[PDB]
Structure formats: C-alpha cells, structure tokens
Amino acid sequence: QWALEDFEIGRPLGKGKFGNVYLAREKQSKFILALKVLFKAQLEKAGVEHQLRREVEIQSHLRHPNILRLYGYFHDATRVYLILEYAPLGTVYRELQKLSKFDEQRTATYITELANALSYCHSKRVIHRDIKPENLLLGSAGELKIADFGWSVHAPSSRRTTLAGTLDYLPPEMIEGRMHDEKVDLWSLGVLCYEFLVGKPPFEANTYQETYKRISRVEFTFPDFVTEGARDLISRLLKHNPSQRPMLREVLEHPWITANSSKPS
Numbered sequence: 001q002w003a004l005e006d007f008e009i010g011r012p013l014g015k016g017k018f019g020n021v022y023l024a025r026e027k028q029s030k031f032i033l034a035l036k037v038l039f040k041a042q043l044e045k046a047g048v049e050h051q052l053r054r055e056v057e058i059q060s061h062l063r064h065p066n067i068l069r070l071y072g073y074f075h076d077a078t079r080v081y082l083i084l085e086y087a088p089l090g091t092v093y094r095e096l097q098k099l100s101k102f103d104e105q106r107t108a109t110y111i112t113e114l115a116n117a118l119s120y121c122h123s124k125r126v127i128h129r130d131i132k133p134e135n136l137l138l139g140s141a142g143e144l145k146i147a148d149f150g151w152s153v154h155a156p157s158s159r160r161t162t163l164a165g166t167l168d169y170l171p172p173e174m175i176e177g178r179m180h181d182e183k184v185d186l187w188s189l190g191v192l193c194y195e196f197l198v199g200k201p202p203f204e205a206n207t208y209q210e211t212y213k214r215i216s217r218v219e220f221t222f223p224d225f226v227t228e229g230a231r232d233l234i235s236r237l238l239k240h241n242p243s244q245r246p247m248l249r250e251v252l253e254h255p256w257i258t259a260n261s262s263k264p265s
C-alpha cells in the first residue's frame with residue numbers, strides 16, 4: 001500500500017541500535033509523522049525478525065493517550081519502514097540531560113502517566129520490558145508516551161534473546177535468565193523514579209560485571225535530599241522478590257504520588 005514515494009523526508013529525529021528515525025510528511029494529506037527505518041541485513045545478522053513482528057503487532061492494536069501510536073509499515077528489499085506518531089517535544093532522556101534532576105511534582109506526574117500506560121498494557125498481559133528514558137517520548141502538551149515495543153511479550157516468559165547494552169533498568173530475575181512476568185515493569189518503574197529525582201540510576205556502575213553485582217544484591221543508597229515519601233515508594237518497587245513488588249493500583253494511590261502529581265489516574 002504505502003511506499004517511500006509517498007513521503008517527503010525531513011531531519012533525523014534520533015538513532016537506535018537498529019532504528020534510524022526521521023521526520024516525514026505524507027504527500028497528499030500533508031500528514032506529519034515519524035519514519036523508523038530498519039536495515040534488513042542487520043535484522044537478519046542479529047536474528048530479531050521476531051522482535052520486529054512483535055513490535056508491529058502489539059503497538060498497532062494498542063490505544064492509549066500515554067502510548068505512542070503505530071499507523072503501519074512497508075519495506076523495499078534493503079529496508080523496513082515503520083510509520084509512527086510524531087512526538088514533537090522529544091525524549092525524556094533529553095529533558096533529563098537538560099535539567100539534571102526533576103523536582104517532585106514533575107517526577108510524580110511522569111510516574112502517574114507511566115503507571116496508567118503500563119496498567120492498560122498489563123490488562124492484556126502485555127509486558128514492555130524495556131522501559132527507560134530514551135524510549136519515553138513527549139507529546140505537544142508535554143504528556144509522556146511509552147514507545148519502542150521491540151522487547152515486549154505476553155506473560156509468563158523466559159528470555160530467549162541476548163541482552164545487548166545496559167543492565168541498568170532490568171530486575172534480578174531477568175538478568176539471571178529466569179522466568180518473569182508483569183512485575184519486571186514495576187521494578188523498572190522504581191529505577192526510573194530514582195533516576196528522575198537523583199540524576200542517575202540506582203545501580204549505575206563502571207563495568208558490566210559490577211552493575212550485575214549491585215542489581216542482584218539490590219545495593220542502592222539515597223542522597224540526603226530525597227524525601228521520606230519518595231524513599232518509601234522506591235524501596236517498595238525495588239524488591240528482589242517480584243511477588244513483594246506492589247500493584248500499579250497501589251502506586252497510583254500512594255500518598256507521595258497523590259500529593260505531588262498534577263494528573264489523575
């Protein structure tokens with residue numbers, strides 16, 4: 001149906017491991033969107049065709065204001081092209097580099113939008129598994145949007161494919177290759193909330209080998225400026241035992257959240 005010919009391409013919006021994402025406008029409708037480009041050879045060399053298919057299937061059928069839309073796809077013997085909703089205010093990653101740390105109101109508001117988004121996902125037993133600042137985008141009114149569903153699945157699950165880069169956001173059960181469920185996204189939520197307030201993730205470390213050690217041991221400390229209510233929430237989500245991690249409904253009505261977030265559930 002669609003092809004390269006139907007689009008005028010604009011400036012680069014970002015780069016990922018496989019993905020190279022561009023601003024683009026559809027010629028007849030003048031519709032502005034984002035074009036995620038993937039090189040078939042690398043997709044094959046790494047054998048992650050199944051991830052791409054998972055990404056397209058899951059993201060196209062989801063509908064939530066805090067989840068990034070995927071409108072379709074096409075391909076052309078060297079490349080695959082994913083047609084995405086354009087997020088005009090960029091990544092949460094960029095915003096963190098800009099401001100160094102977020103205040104409590106900003107942090108709590110992001111956490112609420114996230115927990116709403118994940119709640120919707122878990123109600124279809126979809127687990128995202130790759131929640132981090134580069135994969136969180138911002139809409140025109142500054143609202144948070146989860147994106148990049150390459151690693152997502154239905155639960156329960158084992159990990160069949162190789163973890164490529166950073167360990168910083170993954171729970172103990174996932175790095176250790178065990179099986180896992182919805183609770184992995186709740187660990188990641190804890191990691192984010194820490195990083196939003198402090199400027200760095202709680203198990204950050206100079207080598208792969210050491211980060212692995214700090215995560216399986218749950219070794220983290222707070223700077224003095226982190227308030228008691230934030231400490232309470234984070235300590236509850238970063239539980240070694242998945243079953244001890246709270247439910248999203250509890251996160252959404254935690255006192256520190258309700259006091260500080262400017263958005264409802």
Ligand SMILES: Nc1ncnc2c1ncn2[C@@H]1O[C@H](COP(=O)(O)OP(=O)(O)O)[C@@H](O)[C@H]1O
Pocket residue numbers: 013014015016017018019020021034036068084085086087088090091134135137147148150
């Ligand atoms: N819809 C979008 N709007 C704006 N920027 C985007 C969009 N999608 C991706 N980007 C930028 O491109 C980067 C990589 O996109 P992503 O889909 O996460 O690729 P990968 O799967 O390779 O990580 C993101 O971190 C972001 O900076």
Ligand SMILES: Clc1ccc(C2=CSC3=NCCN23)cc1
Pocket residue numbers: 002026029031071083
């Ligand atoms: Cl190539 C292309 C062109 C348009 C759209 C679209 C998605 S939502 C929407 N509301 C009006 C048009 N439109 C998607 C892809």
Ligand SMILES: [Mg+2]
Pocket residue numbers: 016134135148
């Ligand atoms: Mg990504």
Ligand SMILES: [Mg+2]
Pocket residue numbers: 016148149150151
């Ligand atoms: Mg990906």
